[PDB]
Amino acid sequence: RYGFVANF
Amino acid sequence: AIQRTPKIQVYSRHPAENGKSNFLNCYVSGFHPSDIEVDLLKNGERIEKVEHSDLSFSKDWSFYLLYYTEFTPTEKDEYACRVNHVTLSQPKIVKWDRDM
Amino acid sequence: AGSHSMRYFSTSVSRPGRGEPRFIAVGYVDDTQFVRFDSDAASQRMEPRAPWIEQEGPEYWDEETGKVKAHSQTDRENLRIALRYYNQSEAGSHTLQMMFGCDVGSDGRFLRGYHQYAYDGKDYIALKEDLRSWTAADMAAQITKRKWEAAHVAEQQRAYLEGTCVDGLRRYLENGKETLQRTDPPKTHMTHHPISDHEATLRCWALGFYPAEITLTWQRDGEDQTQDTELVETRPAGDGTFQKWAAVVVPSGEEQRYTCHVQHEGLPKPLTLRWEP
Ligand SMILES: [Zn+2]
Ligand SMILES: [Zn+2]
């Protein structure tokens, strides 16, 4: 199950 | 950007037995950046039906790939893996040794 | 096995003058890959790479596709943000790698979580072991870290890592049980290769083992030969198993001083091998 990321 | 030169192993899936079908592997690892060209060779010539694993990387962020093809080794035929990467002056050719 | 991991690995590489960055993501349970996404591929979908993941229904594939595509878009943005942070030109090619996922024990409990970035092969920012704060490697990464602190990114990731990630790993272990839970011990043997009249090579082989984690070492008179052992990287056989060998150069007639030692989770007890002509 894939997660997520945020902008630098 | 810090660059790392590919490590190359050429090997069969099973112990080589002349006349019996097998798989020829070229495992390239420890390289960065990810662009790389890899050929399997039979007596100096490019093998056509060659597959490879999806790009992944290790704990130190360096990349690894497996290239492979089905084949039937013989006494005479010479196999090799040719690799080109930005860290190399010229392509590196690593010969298949059935004992490595 | 005694513990398990689910990891996703992504690589974004900019292609100046050749369109948007190439984005590749792969998912693993332990040393078994089970999904991929590649922005070059026509499907524009998360694709299966292990038989047992095809047990998942259409909702799964739609949801996972949406998530990995959101990630690819955010990392294209992040490559652009990094250029500003580092005062780099739009002409050069750059790489952004992300790894995230979780470790659980055989009792099914959470052990550790990961969420970390590297830029051009160097650590950029990483979630720390307690899942509450960030290791930021340089000046640029402090800017990101400040933003992620303000937005409480560590809590968001902690919730994902201890929840969804763990739940996903448990399910995959269930569906892929027949293959994922195996601890296949290495088949071992030793070969001998004369180099000259003074020296010969002893090579210790480990074949057909899973998972990939293994320790292969040479001793001489019960002492580790750390700085004299040629040790190749553990390598995939292509059939779901791994291979490795370790070799030492030994003086002629001294073969019986040397022992090869094999540790692997599938072994009832560690092995000790001696040259037996
Ligand atoms: Zn287990
Ligand atoms: Zn002499």
UniProtKB/TrEMBL annotation, chain C:
<keyword id="KW-0597">Phosphoprotein</keyword>
<comment type="similarity">
    <text>Belongs to the MHC class I family.</text>
</comment>
<dbReference type="GO" id="GO:0098553">
    <property type="term" value="C:lumenal side of endoplasmic reticulum membrane"/>
</dbReference>
<keyword id="KW-0732">Signal</keyword>
<feature type="disulfide bond">
    <location>
        <begin position="102"/>
        <end position="165"/>
    </location>
</feature>
<keyword id="KW-0391">Immunity</keyword>
<protein>
    <submittedName>
        <fullName>MHC class I antigen</fullName>
    </submittedName>
</protein>
<dbReference type="GO" id="GO:0042612">
    <property type="term" value="C:MHC class I protein complex"/>
</dbReference>
<dbReference type="GO" id="GO:0000139">
    <property type="term" value="C:Golgi membrane"/>
</dbReference>
<feature type="disulfide bond">
    <location>
        <begin position="204"/>
        <end position="260"/>
    </location>
</feature>
<keyword id="KW-0472">Membrane</keyword>
<keyword id="KW-0812">Transmembrane</keyword>
<dbReference type="GO" id="GO:0031901">
    <property type="term" value="C:early endosome membrane"/>
</dbReference>
<keyword id="KW-1133">Transmembrane helix</keyword>
<dbReference type="GO" id="GO:0012507">
    <property type="term" value="C:ER to Golgi transport vesicle membrane"/>
</dbReference>
<dbReference type="GO" id="GO:0002474">
    <property type="term" value="P:antigen processing and presentation of peptide antigen via MHC class I"/>
</dbReference>
<keyword id="KW-1015">Disulfide bond</keyword>
<keyword id="KW-0490">MHC I</keyword>
<feature type="domain" description="Ig-like">
    <location>
        <begin position="186"/>
        <end position="272"/>
    </location>
</feature>
<keyword id="KW-0325">Glycoprotein</keyword>
<dbReference type="GO" id="GO:0055038">
    <property type="term" value="C:recycling endosome membrane"/>
</dbReference>
<dbReference type="GO" id="GO:0030670">
    <property type="term" value="C:phagocytic vesicle membrane"/>
</dbReference>
